[PDB]
Amino acid sequence: HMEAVQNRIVEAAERVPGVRGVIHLRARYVGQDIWAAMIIGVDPENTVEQAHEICEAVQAAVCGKIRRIESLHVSAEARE
Amino acid sequence: HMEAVQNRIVEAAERVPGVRGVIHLRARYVGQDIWAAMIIGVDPENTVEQAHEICEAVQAAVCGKIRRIESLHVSAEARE
Ligand code: NA
Ligand code: NA
C-alpha cells in the first residue's frame, strides 16, 4: 500500500533522462497527501546546472504521475 | 556568542577554493558541541564531482578551524 506508492515514485524517477538510481526516498503521509524528499544519482561529470535540471525534471515527472504527492524535494549526488 | 561561532563558520567556508557564498547554515548545540548543516554556492559549470570535492574541502577547513564542531554536513547548489 504505502510500498505500492513508493514503488511508483522510484519507477517514475528512474524513467527521467540522467537519473542513475534513487539513492534515498522518504515519503510520509500528511492526511491523504504525500510529502517526500528524494536523492537521485547522476553522472559525476554532469555539471551542477545539469544536475539541477535533472532534479527539476524528476520533480515534474513524479508530481505529474502520482497525484497524491503535494510536496517533493529532489537533490542529486554523484553515482558511478 | 552563538553568533560569533556562526561567523567563524561562514568565514572559514568562504576561504575555500570554489565556494561562492554560504547559502544556508543551521548550527545547534548538543551540550558543548556544535552539530551543523551547510549549503554552499558553487560555479554552475563545475561538475558534480568538483562540487563534491569543494564540499569535502569545506568540511575539512571548517572542522579544522572550529574545534567545537562535532558533526558537519555540507551540500552545494548553483550560484551565479
Ligand atoms: Na550524462
Ligand atoms: Na570554477
Residue numbers in the entry:
A (entry chain A), B (entry chain A): 213 to 292
Publication passage describing the model:
One group of metal ion efflux transporters that regulates metal ion homeostasis and can be found in all domains of life is the Cation Diffusion Facilitator (CDF) protein family. One of the most highly conserved and abundant integral MM proteins is the CDF transporter MamM. MamM was recently proposed to function as a magnetosome-directed iron transporter required for iron biomineralization since its deletion abolished magnetite biomineralization and mutation of residues within the conserved TMD metal-binding site resulted in alterations of magnetite crystal size, morphology and even mineral phase. To summarize our results we present an alternative model for the CDF CTD mode of action, in which we propose that upon metal cation binding, the CTD induces conformational changes towards a tighter and more compact fold which allows the activation of iron transport through the TMD.
Examining this closed state model, three putative binding sites were revealed, in which Asp, Glu and His residues from the two monomers are brought into close proximity and may bind divalent cations. The central binding site is presumed to be the main site as it displays tight packing and contains two symmetry-related His285 and two Asp249 residues. The central binding site D249A mutant also displayed a significantly decreased magnetic response that correlated with reduced numbers of magnetite particles per cell (−47%; P<0.001, Mann-Whitney test). Although the average particle size in the cells expressing D249A mutant and in the cells expressing wild-type MamM was similar, the crystal size distribution of the D249A mutant showed a minor shift towards smaller crystals whereas no defects in crystal morphologies were observed. Furthermore, only the D249A and E289A single mutants revealed an additional slight decrease of the magnetic response during iron induction experiments with iron-starved cells. The D249A, H285A and H264A mutants displayed a minor increase in the number of binding sites compared to the wild-type protein, which may be the result of an increased void volume that allowed the accommodation of additional cations after amino acid substitution to alanine. Therefore, the reduced magnetite formation reflects decreased MamM activities caused by less (e.g. MamM D249A) and/or shorter (e.g. MamM D249A+H264A) TMD activation events. To confirm that these observed phenotypic differences are due to true transport function alternations, we also examined the expression levels of all MamM mutants, their ability to stabilize MamB expression, performed MD simulations for dimer stability evaluation and determined their CTD structures. (ii) All mutants exhibited an apo-MamM CTD-like behavior along the MD simulations, and (iii) an absence of structural differences was observed.
